[PDB]
A paper describes a structure:
The bacterial Makes caterpillars floppy 1 (Mcf1) toxin promotes apoptosis in insects, leading to loss of body turgor and death. The structure reveals that Mcf1 is divided into an N-terminal head region and a C-terminal tail region. The head contains an N-terminal effector domain (NED), an activator-binding domain (ABD), and a protease effector domain (PED). The tail consists of two putative translocation and three putative receptor-binding domains.
To decipher the molecular mechanism of the activation process, we analyzed the Mcf1-[name] interaction by cryo-EM and single particle analysis. To obtain a stable complex, we used the C1397A Δ15C variant of Mcf1 to make sure that the protease is inactive and the C-terminus does not interfere with the interaction (see above) and determined structures of the Mcf1 variant in the absence and presence of [name]. In contrast to the head in absence of [name], the ABD was present in the Mcf1C1397A Δ15C-[name] map, and surprisingly, we observed an additional density close to the ABD and not to the PED. This suggests that [name] binds to the ABD and thereby stabilizes it. We then determined a cryo-EM structure of the complete head of Mcf1C1397A Δ15C-[name] at a resolution of 4 Å that let us unambiguously fit [name] in the additional density. The atomic model of the Mcf1-[name] interface revealed that [name] binds to all three helices of the ABD, which is the same region where the C-terminus is located in wild-type Mcf1. This observation provides a clear explanation why deletion of the extreme C-terminus enhanced the autoproteolysis rate of Mcf1 and therefore defines the C-terminus as important regulator of Mcf1 autoprocessing. We therefore went back to further analyze our 3D classes and found that Arf binding induces a swinging movement of the ABD away from the NED. On a molecular level, we suggest that [name] binding strains the helices of the ABD and drives the movement of its N-terminal part. This movement is possible due to a hook-loop interaction between the ABD and the PED, organized by arginine 957 of the ABD and the loop 1291-1298 of the PED. We propose that this structural feature allows the ABD to swing away from the N-terminal effector, and to pull the cleavable linker toward the catalytic center of the PED for proteolysis.
Numbering used by the authors:
A (entry chain B): 18 to 178
B (entry chain A): 4 to 909, 924 to 1591
The structure:
Amino acid sequence: MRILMVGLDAAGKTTILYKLKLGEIVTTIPTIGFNVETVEYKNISFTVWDVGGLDKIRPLWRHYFQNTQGLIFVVDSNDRERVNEAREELMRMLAEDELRDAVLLVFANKQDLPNAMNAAEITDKLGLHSLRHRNWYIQATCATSGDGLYEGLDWLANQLK
Amino acid sequence: ISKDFTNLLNTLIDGQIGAASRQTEWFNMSPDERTDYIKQVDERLQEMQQSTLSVLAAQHFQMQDNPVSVGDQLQTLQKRRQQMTDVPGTPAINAYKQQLDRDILLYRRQQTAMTHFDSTWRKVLVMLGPDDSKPLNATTLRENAVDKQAKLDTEIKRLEQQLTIQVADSTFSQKYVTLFSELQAYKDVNARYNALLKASATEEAAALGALTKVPQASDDLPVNISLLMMEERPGYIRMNVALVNASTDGRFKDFFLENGRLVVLTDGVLNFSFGTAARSLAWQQQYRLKSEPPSFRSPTYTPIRSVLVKTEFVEKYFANYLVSESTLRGGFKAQLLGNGRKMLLTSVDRKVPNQIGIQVSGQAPNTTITREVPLASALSDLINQNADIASFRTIGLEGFRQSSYHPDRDGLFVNIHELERSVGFAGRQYLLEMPQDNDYLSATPFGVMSVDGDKVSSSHLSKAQTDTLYQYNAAFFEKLEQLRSGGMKASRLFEGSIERTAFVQQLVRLLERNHITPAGVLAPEYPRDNMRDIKGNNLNKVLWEQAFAASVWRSRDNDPLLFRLATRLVKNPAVVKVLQNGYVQSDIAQARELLAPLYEQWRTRAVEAETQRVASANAAQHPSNPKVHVFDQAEVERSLDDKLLILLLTGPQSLEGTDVQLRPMVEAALLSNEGRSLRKQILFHALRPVADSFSKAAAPVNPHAELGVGKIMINNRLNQPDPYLILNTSSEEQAYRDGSYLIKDDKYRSYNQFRPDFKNDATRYMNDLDTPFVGGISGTTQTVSNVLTELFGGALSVKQYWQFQMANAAFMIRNGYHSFFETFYVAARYEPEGADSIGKEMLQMFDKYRVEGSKKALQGKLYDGVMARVLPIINQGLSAADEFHPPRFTRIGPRPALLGQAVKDLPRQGSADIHQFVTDPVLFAKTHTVSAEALVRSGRLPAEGSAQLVKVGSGLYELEYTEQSANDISSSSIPAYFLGYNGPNQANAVPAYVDIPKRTIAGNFLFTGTLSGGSLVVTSLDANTFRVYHDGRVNSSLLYDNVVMAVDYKDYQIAGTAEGLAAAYMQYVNHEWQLVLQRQEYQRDGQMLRLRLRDDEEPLSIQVADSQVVERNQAQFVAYREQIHQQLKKVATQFEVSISGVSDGVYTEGEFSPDHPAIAAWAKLCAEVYDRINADTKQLVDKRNKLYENRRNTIRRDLINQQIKQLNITLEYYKAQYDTVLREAGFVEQSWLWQQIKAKNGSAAVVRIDDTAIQGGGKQRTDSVGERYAISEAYQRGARGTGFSDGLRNFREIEIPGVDDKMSALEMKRLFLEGKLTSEQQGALSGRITETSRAEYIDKVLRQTAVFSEDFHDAGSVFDRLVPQDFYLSLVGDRSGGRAYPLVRAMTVALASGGEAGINSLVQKLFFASADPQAGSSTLLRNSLIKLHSNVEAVQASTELGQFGLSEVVSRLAATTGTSMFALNTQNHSMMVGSTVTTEGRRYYFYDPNVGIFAFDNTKSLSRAMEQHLVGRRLAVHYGSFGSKSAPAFNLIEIDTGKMAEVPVGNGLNVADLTRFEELSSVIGQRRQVEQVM
Ligand SMILES: Nc1nc2c(ncn2[C@@H]2O[C@H](COP(=O)(O)OP(=O)(O)OP(=O)(O)O)[C@@H](O)[C@H]2O)c(=O)[nH]1
Ligand SMILES: [Mg+2]
């Protein structure tokens, strides 16, 4: 199962990726462009593509749609200024026929920050309930603690089997 | 289809590689080659199933005795089918059924035909016979004549009509077959009847016999019914004629379509044949029928031309010959063709019917005497009359072009394509395994291979063994068939199964038993030095040894020595023993062929001896026996062979008596190349028995420590006979008998008996050198070389010795007995003692390289090490024009030589459509491409000459300057005014110009080299004359005045790009000049480039002389500049840079300059946006380089590749999106500056009429005279009167004051740039310059390219890459010295940006670009290294420190920190040198473009090397270095690789862009495909 992990810059995507893969916090390492990892979880080899979310390379995202079975969209729960930019990009992505069968897992990250929006608030700000004909899920997470991440993977695995 | 099968194959591949020692048939592949290999695997598996196991089934079955009968063939086969209609499905079973079906169809048809034939014969004999009151007799038949001859004729006519109607039938049919058989019976009986009527009383009874003799015994078919069975479709037989080679150019016998007619290319061919074989020899042996003699199957093997031809023609001329029945025929028959010509028929086979030697001949067209002569055109026309024009074809033609490409090589096979093409071929026989013995063994369907040290044999299979073999092999293939389809589920080869591993353990030995290994099937075009041959020898080394053997053995130079040897040898009595050798008897037969007429005369002598034998046997005392009263074939054959042998050893001078009458023919023969070749091939075979007969003991004179003193470890072989290489060369069908057999000793058996003994120390040693191996250390060569002083009867000179020994080594390599080394080692042990002996060194050199080869690939360094030491001894007497030089070793496969014997001798006319172009040039140029290329790679074109078109393609024409006069307009040419190419530097005030009249009379067109990013500006000089300017600056039309026509960059720019391309010229039409702009482009075309018209916009635009053009452009330019300033403001805002205060400074003062205050804000803004984006992109450039490194790793299972394409696309987007903006900002600023300078100071400040007011960046730039000469000889600025060309035409007749032959090339080049001599004198001096230059480059460097490799080696170097001697930037002048200045500037960027991988990639590019001299890429490279000769940005990237002595240079490099580079830019040449220190310590690099690139770990070693190289061999003096000869002084120039990388080389390419893992046509593809598309 090929996983595209996307979201705005500074969201925590790389932190989440390495908390899940290595069980550790690493955070200063850059990401601009892409990360990818192969993550074995139960019966499934998840390949998670962590792609940079800077706006000027956001038009390139469409070359990464090939053979993708799952989408992780990561939003900085503490970043209210940019949550609608994330929403616009999500909706633009959901328009793409290549992703028509992709399942959607949202990680509401940085729940540890003082003004962090919660899973439900992110769900409302992003309009997830309006998403018709789409299997989706939102998980409140703190990448630096790892809370919620395996609940996300477990959901994703169960949906994909 | 199954992915499991693909992964399984990949698994066993990876595993077998991991198991590799040195010397293995597996090696790592390109990720493309991977798939081609797997595809050939699958294909040959299908071939095995269809083509050998099937015939095995036909012997596991058929084991039981079904009803069998030669007459009931149809029934016998039918019961064999119904015996087996029950058998389970299996592809081999299906193939068996289908084979049996096809043979059932053929025999059913034939039996029907013969049945109705017999019934027709009986019917016609009843019709012609008398009443039963009398017996059938000639009297009653004669009485019947007047009626029944006319009856026969009438029936024949009716039948011919009705059958011609029936030929409309779509397939053979009972009616068709009926009518044909009847017609043949009627024809034959008519002929027999008329013969009876003509028969005399003594013959009359015989012809009556021939009438009553029905063929009812069925002893053979009627000939025409055999031809019926040969029919390919009802009423037509396929004729074929076999080529020697496919003769697309007429070099060979051929038959081809020419102008819709079929045309035989030559006047007769011995190789015609009719029909096609029904089945393979395999099936023939399975039926145990009579096999057709191999003299049908042997005679040729190259592609064949064939067509259906009307049967009447075949049955008319060729049925006279084609009867299979043994009717006596001579060697020849001559047949009158209906056009009054003869056809000559030739008994090319004395038994077989259906293969024919044919010659057409007749009254020679347009001759004084009616001599009959061979006539290809006559045969062509006659065939076209008798042939069908449909279904002409050539068989196997691409097979030749996809396996041999051409007549490839004069040596043994290297891959299965060369094997299957060789004369030894007959049919591809796979072998299979007999595993139920104690250990696995190989069997044919007919027999198991008995093997012995001396002998190879087969034991024929009894039924139980067949049942074993079949049941096992079928179980395996059934499993494989499941695996391809039912997958692991069906085959149960689960990843952990022990059965899976056993299965693979079986497959691997199958894939070894057949040579399906990669070296067997890949047959690449350009052989990487990693790949290995079918025996695990290095591939490229084998190719080089083959080219060596061919070149050596084809030279005529040693022959006076060899034939002196022969003249002595022939007197020894032991030579007779040679004749009873087994291999000798192969080749004297070819001498029997070459000397055929003399051989005939000899035999006419010899047949006397039989008469003397019978006479003596009767004269013998009281003969109790016909003691020799018989023709003894062996006696006469012996005497004949002895005569032929003697005539081969001694020269034609030995001919005497009556045979001198034919001696001129023999003389013409023996002096041919084939004569000399045979004449020596018999010598070296003759040599072995005499050498053996001395039995002198061994006594090597040079000791060797590594491998045992005083002995040699000769032979060193393990006997491991290959059954596949035996059976895939034609043994006798005695192997096929189903009876035990002992296989022949063919010459190749010497190639296939032996394998290296890995237990011997010598094997370990040789594997350390990694030579090729063939048959071990040649004890034969020792045995010969020990007695040379006795063969020649005296001591050899070391010259004579090495001559003989090289001829011997060539003979040995030619016949496949040994490697090079396997001979040269014992040579070095035996080289005679003498003042120039060299084997001692050669041994020490072997040891030196052994201790290396155990660690590193020597890449041929060994072979060069030998040739360096041998060659000056060989050429010791010769002139440099006559020296031998072998082909030259390279990373790519061996390239042709550049010297001596091997080179000695080893404008386009145009189409008159010029007149259409003159008559309607607008429509012509709208519908045709007009190119200008020939006006680029010629410098120094005349001011005035003849211009013509040459056509090249669909609407594609090329201009050329020509030498033919235009005052013969039939020259396809016109008076035109040429204009030279101007340079590309935007600082240039002095452009190329030429003046042409308004209302011209003398000529009506003007042409120039292709415009690319520049302008052609036409101005009205006076009431009657135009001045046309080629200005290299953009927007130049704004700068000139009185501009009446102009084309600027914007007019042909591809929007959103810097790219553009258009041809522009002037025409004098309807009494006025017209500026005609033909917009074009370069276009990619199958891994090549072409030019084309731009198709995305109007490809043509035309201006008549107008006045408003200046205003119309200038307003547009002002607005567009404003707009682009908006563009740049936008982009800068997008990257957050403050644009505050950025605006045009009012032009106040001064000349044009970069960084003038007026534009400084824009320049700063550009610099900043650059720094932002460069910092941005560098992070991806680095991560991409890291990923290429990652993908270089050997172990990786699978793709990681798509990340490369995604980074590539991202970066190239950034380039396309922003580089154009920054560059255009620079352009609009430079353009505005130049326009301000005009507006204030007038055009005369901004265009200058001549260059003599010299100015530039500084008053002089101290460019080497060499460099300033090369610039001065690849651009035209100003005119070139014709005397320059006259001088070049007569440069040896002309005289020049103050010059002599002993001036240096430097002082000539200097005096030429003084310009004092006349243009004709300057042309002559130029010619003399090139003459001197190439005479010196030859004398100084090519003749000594060998020793440098060894100097750099043993100075202690750590990596090297030789570079191609051959890459040139111009076909004329001194090719050698013009390329250095751009090359060093490219190399220093390559090394700084990509290290050893970059250097490798660039040298690969140069090699390909020199192997394809006119391919699109090599064109583009030539056009992109030019424009680095005088680019002022390179002077922006420089800082000329002083002159320095070498020691100081070394100390400065030692002083440098971080990467740094320096040119030496010696007075006539430019080495480059520099250091990297980034990791792995400090590596020091040195690079001389005449030799190669070398690297070093320490500056002491580096300096010791560079001193040895530059002063120890005086090259610094040939390069004109400064100061004393000893301790030479060099310039140096501290190149800044940080800026040089970004200089434009036109067409939007940065030097970085040529410096990358892709090809140029790749990068341009990506640009076109992501810029114009997307
Ligand atoms: N408090 C808190 N900080 C987090 C959490 N996850 C990530 N961060 C921080 O957010 C910052 C950015 O993390 P990244 O993984 O680089 O985010 P990104 O999406 O890859 O950012 P880009 O590479 O610019 O696209 C880092 O400084 C992390 O320490 C989290 O769960 N809690
Ligand atoms: Mg990040």
